[PDB]
């Protein structure tokens, strides 16, 4: 029913790593890094894995900070979002055909040009608060409805 994914911020004290993906679902849009989990992987080794084949970055410690789920009307696989979030990374972020990262400041994140979700979770994750979501998307710009609640334990 649902489709295990990670995603990972890059967050430092004064700036956040974001990418925008040349093509594919997403594509022209800002966003953390990550993508599907393989089989027989740990969540969190999927999560270092797409960091890695992403942007570039090797990440040492990682920790966990949300989990949302999105549901498309119309698409039958739930995706079942694992969010990470790191401030001890290594090496230069890599620009590929697929990904442009930059670092952003946190009074200057894109949210016009990001996933319209992330304007409801990041003020959350900048805050350092861990959280549940749910999303429900018509199309790729329309949530029709959410749930999003603050978490002791993801």
Known sequence: ASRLYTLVLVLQPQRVL?????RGFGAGRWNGFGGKVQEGETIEDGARRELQEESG???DALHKVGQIVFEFVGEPELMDVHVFCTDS????????DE????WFQ??????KDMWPDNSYWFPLLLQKKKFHGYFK???????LDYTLREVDTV
């Open 18 to 22: 974001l990418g925008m993906k040349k």
């Open 57 to 59: 970055l090797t990440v």
């Open 89 to 96: 990374i290594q090496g230069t972020p890599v620009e590929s």
């Open 99 to 102: 990904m442009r990262p930059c």
């Open 106 to 111: 946190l009074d200057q994140i894109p949210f």
């Open 137 to 143: 998307f018509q199309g790729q710009d329309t949530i």
